[PDB]
Structures are given as structure tokens and as C-alpha cells.
Design a protein around this ligand. Structure first.
Ligand code: HEM
Ligand code: HEM
Ligand SMILES: CNCc1cccc(-c2cncc(CCc3cc(C)cc(N)n3)c2)c1
Ligand SMILES: CNCc1cccc(-c2cncc(CCc3cc(C)cc(N)n3)c2)c1
Ligand SMILES: C[C@H](O)[C@H](O)[C@H]1CNc2nc(N)[nH]c(=O)c2N1
Ligand SMILES: C[C@H](O)[C@H](O)[C@H]1CNc2nc(N)[nH]c(=O)c2N1
Ligand SMILES: [Zn+2]
Lengths: 408, 413
């Protein structure tokens, strides 16, 4: 039946009806909740899924059961018969991609969901083609700093043996090197991937912030390396508005956040290669990339230059350093006219977006574990917002890392 | 359901295996189709409902003491059975009551302090008959737990529920709370979240000092009777004035807090028996005060006032002036508590201890139910180790449960 979600700051209550639409499992059961777990086709399987999606589409353009709708259902039928699959209309592709964003429970940026530039790359056949398409994506989405949401969609899966995959988990990442003395240069979370690239012929400049090459797999073939031209890769020097020594830390990050390891599911079709990009929330860099112990891990270094007493944890020296790091990140991007949102503004927008979705759509799936920012949680409004999590389709899903499932 | 579930720590790659979830008893609120993991809150037991619940708990008790299947075990089973058959209920032995209380804490998915679970002082108040007697028991609890600042965790357990019309209840959600007063102009004085309860007390006869930090009276209900008001002797309420190791102006904010965190509105369930009045207390994690009591918009809301005295650019939010003020506030809370030698734990220490706790529980017990949404601190989340820890949440018994607010259910005599 109907479910209610309360905000405990405002005492506003909303009524979720939309959840009655899902089918894919959350992973939880009545007795066990896995809300903090990160990772919890044939003709007869494929058609009902297609049927539902097509029905959903024509429902959204206000003509459910139209003549257009009828032939479409017939068209899809005969096509799954004689090819064991079907191809989406251009309008259905764009719709399905916007709604996959719209249904992404873990994304705090969804107020933007309808403003999405969709690049159809379903005529791609080679890794060289893929590279070209991704280069245009990057150039378009970056837009000299005035970032624009984009997705590039490559050919759907067919037989599992001829998959398109971007092997990079993100389009822009820094390399990670495993020093002899045991330390780590660059991004320590990328050391494996970085070494796969080296093993494939990549000449590493072995520096701290080295853009990794692209590793592209087209139609199931072995993947191939490509260097993204540097002028397409926008980067930002991180400096502080008060601490003039902060630039001396030598930090930079890239402006374009672009996830390339996920799977886009529309109407039971699987787009295994679908890089999508938006713009950053400052905490992603300031908190997670920089301060995670398993990442760049700069907190102790920064605390040094801030002259903080670091003997007891109760001095909250880590907390102080963290806030200052994130100030710099926001300031730097803003100074450089590169789009960025702070976690206060982003969460505000998200509560407004939630309100919108309950109003017009009867709910909005949201993953509180992911939505609440990794710092200053309860002084952002989403902390106090009950959210319901459920899985709506079309969707972005996780998939196996390609280097675990590829015969060469 | 699967016999083995794996959880991962994404910072350390450490993987743990949970078998304890199999012993889950009641429901989470989640289904396969929806997760309620961030929802805050998702006439008595019959003879036939009580039998298996009692046996379940007794079996569990004698397993813990390495006497499962012993003569004493079977005798206790038979005795409980006869008592349920003749009296429709039964009474716990003192040993069982202590075991059950310690395990309700142990099982409390939302508590980050559970490393301490086996060190809990249990006061048996099941011989209490009147509100005055409840008051005496609660005062003793407060004095014991407070221990002049060297706090000790404790629970006081009042008589179990019988027919439902004779409940013992502490009407206060917490033993020590500050009053809130709503003004004609819509401004609030004191703790704005507490205006409803404060109005109840005033109606019941309380003479309100109308100050910013007025400790509320206890409102105590014995054996189903109308509740009665009692003032906690002020000398038993230890308080800490908040000052800052660096900013000498911080003391000029006239802030202070109470030393003892004590929850009194929850229901303790042991072996199907319901203890509707079981105030328990521990000691504070700094963020509870520094972030929530002090900086929630619906609470004391001091971020603005502190920002101003810190000379912060407050036009752009991207300056993160809220964030900077929050850290300083939580620094001052920890500094004021340590200085007055009142037990407190910072959110780094607590969450690190909880990880060690959880790992030990996986090893010895086969699991450790935890509510990530509650365990992770409300500031600086990802620089505490619990943020990166996958947790399974499930409900084991004995347990602490929520219950309706008594002013919503009480039948006034
Ligand atoms: C436009 C501005 C956007 C903002 C400010 C934003 C914000 C965020 C943030 C902060 C995260 C957390 C990422 C992490 O912790 O790894 C996230 C995740 C996510 N976003 Fe958005 N996002 C934006 C655009 C988009 C777009 C354009 C799409 C798809 C077309 C999208 C789909 C997703 C998905 C599927 C996740 C989950 C990632 C995962 O599971 O690893 N987002 N978003
Ligand atoms: C000994 C030191 C303790 C520490 C450091 C500690 C820490 C915490 C914290 C930080 C919370 C969250 C409170 C909130 O956000 O409102 C909490 C909740 C809780 N604690 Fe512990 N606690 C301690 C002792 C105890 C004891 C002695 C018991 C029971 C015997 C207990 C049972 C619970 C329960 C049931 C909750 C959930 C409260 C609710 O749902 O409102 N804790 N604890
Ligand atoms: C798993 N979440 C943390 C994590 C671990 C490892 C790498 C990343 C990561 C690295 N580079 C870029 C990203 C982009 C994340 C993102 C995606 C999108 C579409 C928008 C946005 N603001 N942020 C993530 C994140
Ligand atoms: C619901 N959590 C936020 C909240 C709202 C309203 C009141 C409170 C509250 C007021 N006074 C004291 C507390 C103490 C909670 C607690 C209990 C125990 C046993 C230990 C501890 N560290 N903290 C909470 C908390
Ligand atoms: C909506 C959300 O569940 C609610 O704000 C929760 C979040 N996590 C919490 N965690 C703790 N420790 N205490 C709380 O009161 C809350 N509130
Ligand atoms: C174990 C836990 O689920 C994990 O650390 C999650 C928590 N929330 C998160 N939230 C975001 N936005 N990104 C993350 O990587 C994570 N990690
Ligand atoms: Zn769940």
C-alpha cells in the first residue's frame, strides 16, 4: 500500500505510491536489511520486459494504447522472434537514458535528470570508433568549464561474447604506482589498473597526477590503449583563499566526473558500455579522493602545515584539516569557472527534487547511505530526510570488471 | 535464506562472515522490493505465544553458561512452563534478568558503544509499587551512573507488563532533558524540540523557571496510575559548562550540557516478557551534543551565533562556514568535558572501538547486527572507519524496542 516518509527537521511527511512499480530485488528481506552493502536473456524473458518499457514510454508521451503504441509492440515482437533481440527507436533511447538517471537511487544530482545530452554510438564497431566517440563526449561535456551532463551509448550486448566495454571505471582517473620501498605514487586505488596499462604498452611518466590512457574493448575483442588528448582533459590547481601555502602541496584534480564501468538497462536490453558524466560535488574530491586512507590520504600532511596538535584524536585535528581542504577545492574550481556544487547546495537541491518527484510521480527512490555527504552529515538536510529505496527500470547497474571475464 | 552472508570493509578489504542473522527473530520493515533502512520507526502476550518465546530465551541462557541440556536447564524449563500455565506469565531469575539486559544492549543495532556491553550495572526494581518508589530508584541510578564524573553504565528495570492497564512508565523520553518554552511571538526558549513534554509537566503542576537550561522534572507512572512529578535533586545532575581551548569568547555563549545520557522511553523485551520502564544510561559521544543537540535546526541551532563570533563569511555556503563552526563547537564540547573529568568519547575513538568490537563479535558470535545509518557519526563520516564498513541489520532478542508515547495512550483516572 501507500508508504510515508517523514523529515524530522521540518516534520514534513510525503506519501510514496511509486514503489508499487518496482520488481528488481533490493537485496533485503523482512528479517535482514542490507542497506549498507555496496554490491548486493531469451525471447520469452526479453519480450515482457520490452512490453513494459514500451508501455511505460507511451504512457509518458500521453498516448497509451495508441496506433503508434500497437505497431511498436508488434514490431518488437517479430524482431525478438527472428533475431532474439530488438533495437530501440532514437526517442526510446533518449527517454530510457534520462529515466535511468532519474531512477538512480544513489545520485544526489538528480534534479538535473531531464537535462541530459544523449550521444547514440550504436553504430560503433571498433575501439578506434569508441575512442573517437569518447573524445567528443569529453570535449562536449567539459565545454571549457561550463560542464554539461552527457551519456554516450555503445552497442547493446548480444551473445555475451561480443561485448562493448570501457575498461576504465571512470573516463578520467590518475595512475597509481607501487614503489620498491613499499610506498605509493599517485592514486593507490588504481595501482592494479595502472599496471594493466603498463603491461599493455603504456609509457608511465611515473608522476603523482598522471592521466591514465583509455582501454577500449569493442565487440568482444581484446582491448586497445588510447591517450586522450591533454587539451580535452580539464584540470584544476587546488589552492586556498587564506592559506597561501596550500598551493605548495602540489594538488590538482580533473574537472570531469565520468563513470564508465556501469551497465545501462532499457527494455531488457543491456548497454554494457555507456560512459556518463556530470559535474562534481566538492566532497567527492575534498573528502573521498584526498582524505580516504586508501586514496591520496593527505590529512596528516595538511594538519602539519596548519600547525595542529596531532597527538590525541579528541583535538579533532583531522576534522579541522578536512574542512579546510574542501574549502580550497570549492574555491579553486570556482576561481577557474569550472562547474562544481557544494554539499550544502546539492543536498538542498535534492530535497527540492524529492518534493517534485513525490508531487508529480508519487515517489523518488533514494539511497540514504549514498545521498548523505561524507562530511557534516546532519547539518545537510538529507540527513534528516527519511528515504525509501527501491529499484525502478530503466536503470544503471553494476557489472563484472572486464579483466575478470575476458578471454584474449 | 542463505546460511552465510559476507560483509566487506572497503577501506581495508577485510571480509567477515555472518551466520548469526539466522537467529533473527522479528522484522526489519524491509522487503525484497523495498528498503526501509533510513526510516526511524518502521493487549498482551497469550499463553501459547509466550511458551516458545520463554523456552527460546531459557535455551539461550543455559547455552551461554555452558549448561545446555543439563538438569538445571530442564528443571527451569518445566518450572517456567508451569508458571505460564497457571498464571499466564512468569518471573525471571535475577541471573536471567541480568543476562537478558546485557544482551539487549549487545543486540542493539543502533548503538555504537556496544564494546562495553558486558559491563553494565543492573538494578532490579521489580519490587517497586509506587511513583515515589520509582523516583527513589531513579535517583539511586543517576547517582551511581554519574559517579562524580567517572560514569558507569547502568539500567534500572521496573516491573514487567501484566494486563496492559497496569504499566510502569517513565514519561520522560530521557531521564535528564532541558525544557523548551514556546513564546507568543513564536520564538522558543530552551530546547525547542521539548516544548510538548514541557507543556505536559506544567499542566501537571510544574513551576517552570522559564530558563534556557532548566532540567525537567521526572514524570513517573507506577502500576497504570496517573503519573506524578518529582524534581531530581540538582546535586545529582552533573553539568558541564562549554568553553573552548582557544576562543575565550566561547564561554560568553552561556552554553552547558548534562553529563549523563539516559534513555527512559524504551521497552526491554526478555523471553517474551515486556519491561515498559527500563531507563538505561552510558556516557556521551561528543557529536551527540556538539552536532545534534547544539546544531540541529530544530534544536539549539547555534551555528549562526557561533559563525558570527568567529568572523566568518556567511553569504556563500560554499565558504563552508557552517562546517568550520561545527568543528570548533565539537572541539569545545570535548574540551569542556575532559577538563571537568566527565567521561566522554570522541567520534574517532568510539567508531574505532566499535570496529574492533564488531570484528570480535563476528569471530566469537558469528555476527553483529548494526544500523549503519545510526552508527556513522553525524559529522566527518568518511574519516571514521565505520563509514567504509558494510553492516547487516537484523533484530535479535532480547531487545530494546520503541513504544507509544504514554500521554497518547494513558487512560486518566
Ligand atoms: C549533473 C550533476 C551530477 C551531480 C552533481 C551528481 C552527484 C553524484 C554524486 C556525488 C555521486 C556519488 C559518487 C560516488 O560517491 O562515487 C553520484 C553517483 C551516481 N550518479 Fe550522479 N551526479 C550528477 C550527474 C549524473 C548523471 C548525468 C548521471 C547519469 C546519466 C548520474 C548517475 C549516477 C549514478 C548511476 C551514480 C551511482 C554511482 C555508483 O553506483 O558508483 N549522475 N552522483
Ligand atoms: C557505554 C557507553 C555508550 C555509548 C558511548 C553509546 C553510544 C550511543 C550513541 C552515540 C547512540 C546514538 C544516540 C542518538 O543518536 O540518539 C546510542 C544509541 C543507543 N544505545 Fe548506546 N551508548 C552507550 C551505552 C548504552 C547502554 C548502556 C545501552 C543499553 C543498556 C545502550 C543502548 C542503546 C540503544 C538501545 C540506542 C538507540 C537509541 C534510540 O533508538 O533512540 N547504549 N548509543
Ligand atoms: C565508489 N565511490 C567512491 C569512488 C571510488 C573510486 C573512484 C571514484 C570516482 C573516481 N573518479 C570519478 C568519479 C565520478 C563519480 C561521479 C559521477 C557522476 C556521474 C557525477 C559525479 N558528481 N560524480 C568517481 C569514486
Ligand atoms: C534521536 N536521536 C537524536 C535525539 C533527539 C532527541 C533527544 C535525544 C537525546 C537527548 N538526551 C540524551 C540522549 C542520549 C542518547 C544516548 C543514550 C545512551 C545510553 C548513550 C549515549 N551515548 N547516548 C539523547 C537525541
Ligand atoms: C532520517 C534518518 O534516518 C534520521 O535522520 C536518522 C539518521 N541517523 C541517525 N543516527 C543517529 N545516531 N541518531 C539519529 O537521530 C539519527 N537520525
Ligand atoms: C560500506 C558503505 O556502504 C560504503 O562505505 C559507502 C557508504 N556511502 C557512500 N556514499 C557515497 N556517495 N559514495 C561511497 O563510495 C559510499 N560508500
Ligand atoms: Zn533494507
Amino acid at each position: 500500500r501507500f508508504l510515508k516518509v517523514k523529515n524530522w527537521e521540518t516534520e514534513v511527511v510525503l506519501t510514496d505510491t511509486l514503489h508499487l512499480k518496482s520488481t528488481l530485488e533490493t537485496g533485503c528481506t523482512e528479517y535482514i536489511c542490507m542497506g549498507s552493502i555496496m554490491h548486493p536473456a531469451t525471447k520469452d524473458q526479453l519480450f515482457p520486459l520490452a512490453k513494459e518499457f514500451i508501455d511505460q514510454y507511451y504512457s509518458s508521451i500521453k498516448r497509451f494504447g495508441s496506433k503508434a503504441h500497437m505497431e511498436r509492440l508488434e514490431e518488437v515482437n517479430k524482431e525478438i522472434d527472428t533475431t532474439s533481440t530488438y533495437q530501440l527507436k532514437d526517442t526510446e533511447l533518449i527517454y530510457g537514458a534520462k529515466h535511468a538517471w532519474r531512477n538512480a537511487s544513489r545520485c544526489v544530482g538528480r534534479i538535473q535528470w531531464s537535462k541530459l545530452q544523449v550521444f547514440d554510438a550504436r553504430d560503433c564497431t571498433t575501439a578506434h570508433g569508441m575512442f573517437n566517440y569518447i573524445c567528443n563526449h569529453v570535449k562536449y561535456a567539459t565545454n571549457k568549464g561550463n560542464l554539461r551532463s552527457a551519456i554516450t551509448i555503445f552497442p547493446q550486448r548480444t551473445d555475451g561474447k561480443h561485448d562493448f566495454r570501457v575498461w576504465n571505471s571512470q573516463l578520467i582517473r590518475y595512475a597509481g604506482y607501487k614503489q620498491p620501498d613499499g610506498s605509493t605514487l599517485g592514486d593507490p586505488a588504481n595501482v592494479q589498473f595502472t599496471e594493466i596499462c603498463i603491461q599493455q604498452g603504456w609509457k608511465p611518466p611515473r608522476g603523482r597526477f598522471d592521466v591514465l590512457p583509455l582501454l577500449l574493448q569493442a565487440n568482444g575483442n581484446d582491448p586497445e590503449l588510447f591517450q586522450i588528448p591533454p587539451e580535452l582533459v580539464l584540470e584544476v590547481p587546488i589552492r586556498h583563499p587564506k592559506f597561501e601555502w596550500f598551493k605548495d602541496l602540489g594538488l590538482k584534480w580533473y574537472g570531469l566526473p565520468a563513470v564508465s564501468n556501469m551497465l545501462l538497462e532499457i527494455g531488457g536490453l543491456e548497454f554494457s558500455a555507456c560512459p556518463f558524466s556530470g559535474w562534481y560535488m566538492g566532497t567527492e574530491i575534498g573528502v573521498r579522493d584526498y582524505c580516504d586512507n586508501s586514496r591520496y590520504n593527505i590529512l596528516e600532511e595538511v594538519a602539519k602545515k596548519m600547525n595542529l596538535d596531532m597527538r590525541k584524536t579528541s583535538s579533532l585535528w583531522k576534522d579541522q584539516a578536512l574542512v579546510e581542504i574542501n574549502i580550497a577545492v570549492l574555491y579553486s574550481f570556482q576561481s577557474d569557472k569550472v562547474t562544481i556544487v557544494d554539499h550544502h547546495s546539492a543536498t538542498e537541491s535534492f530535497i527540492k527534487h524529492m518534493e517534485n518527484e513525490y508531487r508529480c510521480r508519487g515517489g523518488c527512490p533514494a539511497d540514504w547511505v549514498w545521498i548523505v555527504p561524507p562530511m557534516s552529515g546532519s547539518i545537510t538536510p538529507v540527513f534528516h530526510q527519511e528515504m525509501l529505496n527501491y529499484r525502478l527500470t530503466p536503470s544503471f547497474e553494476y557489472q563484472p570488471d572486464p579483466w575478470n571475464t575476458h578471454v584474449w
